[PDB]
């Protein structure tokens, strides 16, 4: 549905709301998605997004180096 | 409290189960988390992990260049 040029507009609109007007805080990302793409977060799974966050080179595997980003999250 | 040596042993135990024995697939990561850190996925939100995936330099702001990762996933 949306084009990449539209998405540039969208990024600029919501990034200007608070703080640095050229960058998106977590609160502005939440408002962007709730307003423009409200079904994006209910289709996503947390496990799938953690895996994408860890797998930086996109080979479908988490190496021991890449696992170090998960180790930072563990409470202890 | 888990030491660093213990976390290395956990990584190696679950990485060896399937396929490449030195790297973790998503199915092995699922088993590792359900067994060793069961509340971790329960406590995470999809939005929080999507933000962390996009915020590559960890300054808590997503720049337009960081945002492009999401643009390529949802737009043509
Ligand atoms: Ca902003
Ligand atoms: Ca990888
Ligand atoms: Ca493996
Ligand atoms: Ca950033």
Swiss-Prot record, chains A, B:
EF-hand domain location is 10-45, 42-76
The record lists Ca(2+) 2 as bound by 55, 57, 59, 61, 66
Q: Which residues form the signal peptide?
A: none
Q: Which residues bind Ca(2+) 1?
A: 23, 28
Q: Which Pfam families match?
A: EF-hand_1 (PF00036), S_100 (PF01023)
Q: Which residues carry this modification: Phosphoserine?
A: 39
Tell me where on the tree of life, at the top rank, the source sits.
Eukaryota
GO cellular component terms, alphabetically, are: apical plasma membrane; basolateral plasma membrane; cytoplasm
Entry GO MF terms: calcium ion binding; calcium-dependent protein binding; vitamin D binding
Sorted keywords for this record are: Acetylation, Calcium, Metal-binding, Phosphoprotein, Repeat, Vitamin D
PANTHER family named among the record's database cross-references: PROTEIN S100-G, S100 CALCIUM-BINDING PROTEIN
Its name, as the record gives it, is Protein S100-G
Q: Which organism is it from?
A: Bos taurus
Lineage of producing organism: Eukaryota, Metazoa, Chordata, Craniata, Vertebrata
Q: Which gene encodes it?
A: S100G
């Amino acid at each position: 549905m949306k084009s990449p040029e539209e998405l540039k507009g969208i990024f600029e609109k919501y990034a200007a709301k608070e703080g640095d007007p050229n960058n998106l805080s977590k609160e502005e990302l939440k408002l962007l998605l709730q307003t423009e793409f409200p079904s994006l977060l209910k289709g996503m799974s947390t496990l799938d997004e953690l895996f994408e966050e860890l797998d930086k080179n996109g080979d479908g595997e988490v190496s021991f180096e890449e696992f170090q980003v998960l180790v930072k999250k563990i409470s202890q």
